[PDB]
């Protein structure tokens, strides 16, 4: 645990949190990881336990051991939770992707959303209701949901989520929304404007922010562009930067800081060895679970 908490410093500027991720393994693999989470971060997103493959492996049969653990740890330690994720083309069981009848898929979708959200009703700050539903060009991804139900799946997902847990902020999350003017950014904005105008309850836009070295400075403009979609809020949801340079990390932190709609940042992992992109050493803590230069840079920029 770093003596200075970047989450505490971020909150002092009016932000909701500066968080990270976890699940049973990383929370128990050693003593430093959970200690770092409790001391320096104020929010948690389950890395995998809440995804469709892990929660409803078979039709109508749910498995909540792993998600229960993450939620219970977060709640027992004063950490906000971002549920992740409800509807996604990846990490989706074959029983779902093989469905071809529209009403059947809708029933399945609603039951999945309802069962998962009901179990953690009132304990979730925000839910990534929809994940990665856009092609790079801004058009809608031809996932099973889009192919079988059509664009109406967006309304169905959000309305169902809103009804099940009105306390949670409902988000649409995506990657490559990293610079103003990018086709995917433009598509996100135009679709969300349309959906909101149609009465669909979308509270926020989540920008994954999985970056390469030197890409941090473009984030400020991206958030500004995303702000025009008209949602109540936005958030950097899965932050990691190849090389973890101080300039890049400070640039991203400042991007959120200077944008009213950005409620917080979630770094996708604590220490490099546990990163899904470990070969790029993209996190704030090293192989010894010690704070890297970027962590201190962030602490001193706040």
What is the binding site for Na ion (CB under 5 A)? 46, 48-51, 54-55, 64, 66-67, 84, 89, 133, 143, 145, 162, 166, 168, 227, 229, 231, 235, 237, 264, 266
Task: Please say which residue, 101 or 290, places its beta carbon nearer to Na ion.
Answer: 101
Q: What is the dihedral of CA 232, 265, 122, 134, to 10 degrees?
A: 60
Hey, CA dihedral for 61, 62, 63, 65, is it positive or negative? negative
Question: Shortest Cβ distance from residue 185 to Na ion (Å)?
Answer: 11
Who contacts 176 (Cβ-Cβ below 8 Å, separation ≥6)? 136, 182, 184, 208
Question: Which helix (H) or strand (E) segment is 102 a member of?
Answer: helix 102-119
The tokens of 126 are what?
A: 């925000």
State the nearest-atom distance from the C-beta of 76 to Na ion, in Å.
17
Rounded-to-5 percentages of helix, strand, coil across the chain: 45, 20, 40
Which of the following is catalytic: 56, 132, 151, 233? 132
Which of 3/14 has CB closer to Na ion?
Answer: 14
Nearest 5°: phi and psi at 74? Answer: -60, -55
- The CA-based diameter of the chain, rounded to the nearest angstrom, is 55
Distance of closest approach, residue 161 Cβ to Na ion, in angstroms: 6
Query: Please, what is the minimum distance in Å from the beta carbon of residue 153 to Na ion?
Result: 7
Q: How far is CA 225 from CA 39, 134, 186, in A?
A: 33, 16, 8
DSSP annotation of 28: H
Residue with Cβ nearer Na ion (84 or 290): 84
Nearest to Na ion of 23, 272 (CB atom) = 23
Whether 159 is catalytic is no
Peptide bond preceding 141: is omega within 30 degrees of 0, i.e. cis?
no
Annotated catalytic residue 151: no
Residues 220, 177 contacting (CB under 8 angstroms): no
| Complex with Na ion: residue 34 or 46, whichever CB lies closer | 46
- Least distance (Å) from Na ion to the CB of residue 7? 12
Concatenated DSSP letters for 115-157?
HHHHHTTTT-SEEEEEES-B-TTSSBP--HHHHHT-THHHHHH
Burial of 76 (0-12, 13-18, 19+ CB in 10 A): exposed
The nearer residue to Na ion, 208 or 251, going by C-beta atoms, is 208
Q: Are 18 and 42 in contact (CB under 8 A)?
A: yes
Minimum gap (Å) between residue 227 Cβ and Na ion: 5
Active site residues: 132, 238
């Amino acid at each position: 645990q770093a003596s200075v908490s970047i989450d505490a410093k971020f909150k002092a500027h009016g932000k909701k949190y500066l968080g990270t991720i976890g699940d049973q393994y990383t929370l128990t693999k050693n003593t430093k990881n959970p200690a770092i989470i409790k001391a320096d971060f104020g929010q948690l997103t389950p890395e995998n336990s809440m995804k469709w493959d892990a929660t409803e492996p078979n039709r109508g049969q749910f498995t909540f051991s792993g998600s229960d653990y993450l939620v219970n740890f977060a709640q027992s330690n004063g950490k906000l939770i971002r549920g992740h994720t409800l509807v996604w083309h990846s990490q989706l069981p074959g029983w779902v992707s093989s469905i071809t009848d529209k009403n059947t898929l809708i029933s399945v979708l609603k039951n999945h959303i309802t069962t998962v959200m009901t179990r953690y009703k009132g304990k979730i700050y925000a839910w990534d209701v929809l994940n990665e539903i856009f092609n790079e060009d801004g058009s809608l991804r031809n996932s099973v949901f889009y192919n079988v139900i059509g664009e109406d799946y967006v309304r169905i997902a959000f309305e169902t989520a809103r009804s099940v847990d009105p306390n949670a902020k409902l988000y649409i999350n995506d990657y490559n929304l990293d610079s103003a003017g990018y086709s995917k950014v433009n598509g996100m904005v135009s679709h969300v404007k349309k959906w909101l105008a149609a009465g669909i309850p979308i509270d926020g836009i989540g920008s994954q922010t999985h970056l390469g070295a030197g890409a941090g400075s473009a984030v400020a403009g991206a958030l500004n562009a995303l702000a025009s979609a008209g949602t109540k809020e936005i958030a950097i949801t899965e932050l990691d930067i190849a090389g973890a340079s101080s300039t890049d990390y400070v640039n991203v932190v400042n991007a959120c800081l200077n944008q009213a709609k950005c409620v917080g940042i979630t770094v996708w992992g604590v220490a490099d060895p546990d990163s899904w992109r470990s070969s790029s050493s993209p996190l704030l803590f090293d192989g010894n679970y010690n704070p890297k230069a970027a962590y201190n840079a962030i602490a001193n920029a706040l």
